Amino acid sequence: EFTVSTTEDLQRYRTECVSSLNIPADYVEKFKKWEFPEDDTTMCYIKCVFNKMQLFDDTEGPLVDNLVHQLAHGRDAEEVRTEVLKCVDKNTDNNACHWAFRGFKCFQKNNLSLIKASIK
Ligand SMILES: CCCCC/C=C\C/C=C\C/C=C\C/C=C\CCCC(=O)O
Ligand SMILES: [Co+2]
Ligand SMILES: [Co+2]
């Protein structure tokens, strides 16, 4: 049921989320440059994209098995899973947007290369 996301999948999901959340043009400009402001508009966008990629569920949180499928082929699944699990936490402030974004920010600090490589 999980399918890995390609570059085109991700571009479609970006477009869909910009549409459905009515993301302002200024934010889109920033997302294109990999700039993600610390605000609800951005956080809900990332949640939206992750929902569509089947990498995050609003109730269960990060979908670790799916993240490993997305990121790890050709690499050491154990290493990747370990790095993912370091960024997996509880929904302590009962906010799926905050939750999804926190995990993204955690992971991309040290694993940006792995993220970019996953999108072929
Ligand atoms: C437990 C924390 C897990 C966080 C994992 C981080 C990223 C997901 C991993 C692989 C999927 C690849 C790209 C999606 C990443 C960011 C959204 C792009 C937004 C945009 O470009 O407009
Ligand atoms: Co797999
Ligand atoms: Co392990």
Residue extents of the structural domains in the chain: 1-120
Helix (H, G, I), strand (E, B) or coil at 109: helix
Closest ligand 1 atom, CA of 55?
Answer: 8
Cβ(53)–Cβ(13) under 8 Å? Answer: yes
Task: Show Cβ contacts of residue 109 under 8 Å, excluding neighbours closer than 6 positions.
Answer: none
**Which amino acid residue places its CA nearest to atom 9 of ligand 1?**
115
CA of 83 to the centre of ligand 2 (A): 16
Q: Tokens 């508009």 belong to which residue?
A: 41
For the chain, state the CA radius of gyration. 14
Please report how many Cα atoms fall inside a 13 Å half-sphere around the Cα of residue 109, on the Cβ side. Answer: 10
Token pair for 71: 């990121």
Please measure the distance between the N-terminal and C-terminal CA atoms of the chain and give it in whole angstroms: 19
Cβ(18)–Cβ(28) under 8 Å? Answer: yes
Cβ(100)–Cβ(37) under 8 Å? Answer: no
Closest ligand 1 atom, CA of 71?
Answer: 10
- Resolution (Å units): 1.9
For helices 40-52 and 25-32, angle between their N-to-C axes, nearest 10 degrees: 60
Helix (H, G, I), strand (E, B) or coil at 60: coil
